[PDB]
Curated annotation (Swiss-Prot), chains A, B, C, D, E, F, G, H, I, J, K, L, M, N:
Domain notes: The CARD domain mediates interaction with CASP1 and NLRC4.
Domain Pyrin: 1-91
Outcome after substituting D48A: Abolishes interaction with PYDC1
The protein's name in its UniProt record: Apoptosis-associated speck-like protein containing a CARD
Localization (cell): Cytoplasm; Inflammasome; Endoplasmic reticulum; Mitochondrion
Organism: Homo sapiens
Amino acid sequence: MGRARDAILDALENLTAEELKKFKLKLLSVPLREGYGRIPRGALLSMDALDLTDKLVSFYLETYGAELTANVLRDMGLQEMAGQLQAATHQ
Amino acid sequence: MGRARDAILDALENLTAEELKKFKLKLLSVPLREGYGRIPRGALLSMDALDLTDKLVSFYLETYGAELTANVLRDMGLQEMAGQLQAATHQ
Amino acid sequence: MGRARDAILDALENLTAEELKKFKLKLLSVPLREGYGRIPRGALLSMDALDLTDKLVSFYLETYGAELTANVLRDMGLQEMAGQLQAATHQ
Amino acid sequence: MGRARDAILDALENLTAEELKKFKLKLLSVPLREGYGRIPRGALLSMDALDLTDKLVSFYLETYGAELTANVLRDMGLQEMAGQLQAATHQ
Amino acid sequence: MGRARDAILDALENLTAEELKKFKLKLLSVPLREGYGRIPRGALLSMDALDLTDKLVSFYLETYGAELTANVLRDMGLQEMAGQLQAATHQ
Amino acid sequence: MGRARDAILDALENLTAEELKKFKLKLLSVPLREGYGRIPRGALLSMDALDLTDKLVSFYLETYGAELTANVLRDMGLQEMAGQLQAATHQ
Amino acid sequence: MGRARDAILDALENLTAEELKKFKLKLLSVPLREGYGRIPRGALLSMDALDLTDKLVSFYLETYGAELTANVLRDMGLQEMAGQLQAATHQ
Amino acid sequence: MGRARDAILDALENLTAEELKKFKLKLLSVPLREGYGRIPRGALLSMDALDLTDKLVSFYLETYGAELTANVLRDMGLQEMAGQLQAATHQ
Amino acid sequence: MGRARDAILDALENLTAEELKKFKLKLLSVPLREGYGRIPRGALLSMDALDLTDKLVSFYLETYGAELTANVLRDMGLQEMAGQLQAATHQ
Amino acid sequence: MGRARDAILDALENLTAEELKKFKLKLLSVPLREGYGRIPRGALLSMDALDLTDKLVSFYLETYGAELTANVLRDMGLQEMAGQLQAATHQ
Amino acid sequence: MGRARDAILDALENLTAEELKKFKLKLLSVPLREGYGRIPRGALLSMDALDLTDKLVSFYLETYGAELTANVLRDMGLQEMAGQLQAATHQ
Amino acid sequence: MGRARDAILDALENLTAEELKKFKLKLLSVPLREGYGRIPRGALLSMDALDLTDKLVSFYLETYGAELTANVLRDMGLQEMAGQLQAATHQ
Amino acid sequence: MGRARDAILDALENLTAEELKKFKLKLLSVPLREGYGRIPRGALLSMDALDLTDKLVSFYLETYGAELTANVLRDMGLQEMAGQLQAATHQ
Amino acid sequence: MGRARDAILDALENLTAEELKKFKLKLLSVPLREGYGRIPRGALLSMDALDLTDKLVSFYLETYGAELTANVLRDMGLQEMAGQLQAATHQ
């Protein structure tokens, strides 16, 4: 199996309990590519980091999951974690 | 078979674990059209979203089930979920 | 032979294991027209869906069997199955 | 056949699994008028709502069964279900 | 020929597969009037409802058979079938 | 189905979590008219607003439940909420 | 015939299925007086309450069967059933 | 049947979940009179209030069960519940 | 015989107890081609993964069963299991 | 001699006992061509797979028997057994 | 007589009932060598471990039966039981 | 008949459901004396306390069964039940 | 049998519930040696420590199971636990 | 049974939620006498005062459990509670 389910985790474990809430909230309205579903609010607003990584790799694929996570992280301002995630995923 | 069972599921899965309890509680006293039964309290206060959608579509019909769910959601305040459900059901 | 023995089966097979028990219990006290016997308690509380349909069509005629099944199903609130049964049997 | 086997069911399905256990426990020590037996503890501690209603109407007659159910429900506090049961059975 | 042979059947067909065994067990120890024999344990613990009714009406008389069946049903707790049998047999 | 179950909820939702504890505590010693039970401590000291409304409408009736809630709210000082509840319930 | 075949039932029927298995297991190692056989393990671990009472009264006598049942019931802790069984059998 | 099985419940429902664990823990080491068994630890640390009352009235008798519950409640500090239980049981 | 009965299992065994229920629920209303029956609701809402795969390959053929499972999995959002299912079945 | 009795046999042995009862029940109401009799209920509701195949090939002919059993299997939902049966019988 | 009928048993008795169903399911679609028949689905989905071993050694020979069991165990994941079976069979 | 089948039960009944699963798991890898068999994994991971005691006394004799139970309890940490079992068994 | 099933357990019981979730998550994407299967996601995300150890020793052998557990523990950071496991396993 | 399971509780309920964590942490490294096991981290870092007392008196005996608790309490500075525990235990 691909390692992308780990590189996401290392990016979502560096977020404090305050930035994780913001990440989950931003995940509710980020534009999505065609053919991909959206996580329901009831489950999204209660998952912790681990379930979030699992469901991100589940709904989307490894490549698109990593790209979406990086885009959301750069959207909220945190570019250190976003840069680390992009570096880990690309090569 | 009507697709309104999926529309109700897509609306009841966007409610938090606390809003679902409110929905189930309001379902106990909402006025009902004549000839339609009322869900017993013993099972109402224990079902999750999936069982709730199934039993809602079973007890009432597709059209009346969607209408009742929209009315209950509108009553409790959530104006976005009711709008989405009405848009999905009407056309 | 009449097809009413198949419409009842398609309706009693759509009930979960808990609703079938309720159906069998309510079959013990539903009002009956004159000239029609009542299913004994000893055998009724143990039959599955197939035996129940067979005994319903044997004790009661096809028209009255379907009508009684629809009435009992509508009494307990399950009206999707009742409407399906009425549509199947009337025409 | 009398309808008392139904009005009891509607009383026992409107209370959750938590106080159904309390109802079954109270049924072991409720005072009984002479000539009526007591439900054995071996089955009473595992019977669900449907079986409980059936056994209540079987051991106890319709009038006394409804009266005993109403008295037990009133004893444990729930006076809405007790009121509904009295209204249904009395007239 | 006596009609109460039917009524006993109507009383023993309302017993599920469980309390029929209990009825047969109580038939081995119920007190008996003088001049009446006891059913041997070898064949009693294997008969169904029909054979049980036939042998009950054979060993004892029609009136005493009905009375004994009613007494055993009353002693084991079932006070509805016993009342129904008494109503059927006395008049 | 009375609407008094919804009027109480609106009364128990506009008060903060700090005074919900005070309301539940005052509910333990409020005088009660004869024939009505008292909610046990073990359950009472743990239910939130929704279960509290359900239990209040269950143990007492609609009219008495609303009156008791209004009286308790008036006792703890909140005159705005008691007035709103009385206005909703009376007409 | 002896009535102790009934009282024994009244002891083995008011205990749950979880402790019936414990009773049957403990019946395997209880000491016995001389001249009395032991119930075979193959049949003992499968009988229900009724067969257990019948076999207990068959293998042992009325008095010794009741006494052994009371002793075993005391050994497993249940003293209410043992007390009522002794009260029934002694006089 | 004695009513003391009802008083004990009224004493075990007036203490919160945290105090129930303490009660069950102190029940593991309270001194017992001779001839009375001790509840096994495996089942004692998992029962709720209802099963606890049933087991207490089962292993011990009505009077000793009430007395032991009162003594344990007094030892663990709760004097109000112990006094209420003693008042309910003694007269 | 065809190997697609193994791939479907490999897709249905990667779902937790929660989205398996969603899969079963959405299997009740997915559009079907002509000549293909619909799984009865009574048995569908109780099967585990293994029975579900067996029945899916039974009612629908190898290719259509795999395609329907893939479509349903895509509809609920899980496009990781759907992707591998399509990869396995197509070649 | 015609080997259609083997195709019917190995088609009816690929379905569980639960589906065999459904097959036997639906055999009671399937439409029949003129000149062909109907299997009586007395034997139909008791035969196992082997003598069922024997009776199907006896009452009807090889071609008509295979066609009828294929139609019944198709109607009750199993499209996999029906397809292989048609493939075997046609050529 | 060969001992492979025992080595298979020790392999099919050391796995829980959850993966016994998986074993029986995968036995329906595993590739088979030429000249070897397939176990009918009607009986296969109901046998326990002992009947399964007997049928495996009857349909397939000792060596091929052991080899097929080892292959099926390997495919489903369990490589501890498969290694034990290979060690017991080969030498 | 030895009493060691009881001392084991008292040892396996004073430990909660969490330690019972650990006990059963450790029973799969404990070193065994020569000439004694090992309990198969299929049945071991599903038996409760009573079945576990029966099988322990069946496979291993009284002395070795008690000694093995004491050793397993000691190895898994519980030094109180192990000491109690040793005291009960040795003298 | 080998002692390796005990070394793993002691490693998995010394990490809290939050690290067990991380361990089970990293078990979904760890590289695997050829010929070894992967634990299905549906069952993996719900097992506790004991079931996890059982499955780890089941799918992978003792040596590879311990090695993989140590590798995952080092990957997720815990170096004390991995060192203890390696010391227990190697000698 | 010894009273050491109570005095230990009296020493652990006088600890606020802060130094209880310190007590549980220091319980992970306190030297142990030979023959006694160590509580795993998985449970030690989540158990409350009552579970802690139960597991302390379970893993160790009464005398050693009390002595070890006193030693740990004295180690972390709290001498009032250690002195009280010693006074309660020794005499």
